[PDB]
């Protein structure tokens, strides 16, 4: 195939230059499990039990007894396939555009196929990271004009039925108020049996800069970050608490455990960008190529994620 098709060989020889996605830092090695599905859905079944009323006293003769009820829950995860197209210069036409230190028409913004593919793959990986973190797909910095997505497609920041805290605008710079809200969210968190697990916190750079200050008369050898780590260690059975900073978030703090039982990422085996076999060709030197990627696959138990939003005026 490599002899017959130049584009496949170029993709194979340049695929190693693409950096790994940053989403991998947000999940434990066991939390990610690939699935074989391009588009469609997957279903799972859970069973719950509940007590209808107070227990019945067994005294003398009695026929009416309190009952224990059961319930089924079906959880569906949806997957979506998306595609992009990019223009580039033909392989037989590269020699007429090779220059002293570059290849491609600068005046017309035309590139060799390899470089164009690498840049498009990097941009698509950035978009996938954004979708995984925030649960939305958009190209505007304001976040509007979002692509309409299928239901049962959520991210870590838009997951429903999670603990949500709001820090008031007037206390935007008050780390004591921020930590009070964080403690309230931590108290409302419900880990249950899966408590002896590492915890993960993701913060914006401004939040991290506020954190790194000493704890408050100010204390010695004790920072707000250390106090937060101790607070989370109180509830995770003194397990490792990791802290990461992401420029994608803005005035947002995300706290969640790293246990596969509570939160699991089952992405498609074709989620990362993949070249298409169809290549548009014409009499000119400009060709077109396509890249495919797959979105969806995040599953989380309810009331297991704390999302703190610091309102900015």
């Amino acid at each position: 195939l490599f002899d017959e098709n130049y584009y496949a060989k170029a993709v194979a020889n340049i695929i190693g230059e693409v950096k790994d996605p940053i989403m991998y830092k947000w999940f434990s090695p066991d939390q990610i499990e690939d699935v074989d599905l391009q588009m469609g859905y997957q279903k799972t079944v859970k069973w719950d039990a509940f007590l209808n009323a107070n227990p019945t006293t067994i005294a003398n003769e009695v026929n009416t007894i309190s009952t224990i009820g059961f319930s089924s829950e079906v959880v569906r995860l949806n997957y979506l396939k998306l595609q992009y197209k990019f223009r580039h210069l033909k392989q037989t036409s590269e020699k007429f555009y090779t220059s002293d230190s570059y290849i491609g028409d600068i005046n017309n913004n035309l590139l060799p196929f390899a470089q164009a593919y690498k840049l498009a793959s990097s941009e698509i990986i950035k978009l996938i990271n954004h979708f995984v973190l925030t649960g939305t797909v958009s190209i505007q910095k304001d976040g509007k004009n979002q692509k309409r997505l299928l239901p049962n497609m959520y991210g870590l920041l838009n997951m429903p039925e999670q603990i949500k805290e709001e820090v008031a605008s007037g206390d935007k710079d008050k780390m004591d108020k921020i930590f009070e809200k964080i403690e309230a969210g931590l108290s409302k968190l419900e880990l249950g049996d899966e408590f002896s697990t590492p915890m993960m916190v993701i913060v914006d750079p401004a939040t991290s800069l506020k954190l790194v200050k000493p704890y408050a008369a100010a204390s010695s050898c004790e920072k707000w970050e250390d106090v937060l780590i101790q607070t989370i260690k109180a509830i995770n059975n003194r397990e490792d608490v990791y802290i990461e900073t992401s420029n994608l978030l803005k005035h947002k703090i995300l706290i969640y455990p790293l246990n596969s039982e509570l939160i699991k990422f089952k992405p498609s085996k074709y989620m990362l960008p993949t070249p298409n076999e169809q290549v548009d060709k014409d009499s000119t030197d400009v060709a077109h190529s396509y890249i495919d990627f797959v979105l969806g696959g995040l599953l989380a138990t309810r009331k297991t994620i704390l999302q703190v939003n610091i309102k900015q005026s």
Binding site: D20, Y24, T274
Partner: protein, 40 residues
Amino acid sequence: ASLLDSNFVPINFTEFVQAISNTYKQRRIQFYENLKRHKR
């Protein structure tokens, strides 16, 4: 059946895509193996 294997020779585009997927999986496995998170 991965692009990281120099001896690999894709017969067709389907095998090439499968090799790409295997290469991505091996890369993420290697990243998790090499990762060392900073405690405290």
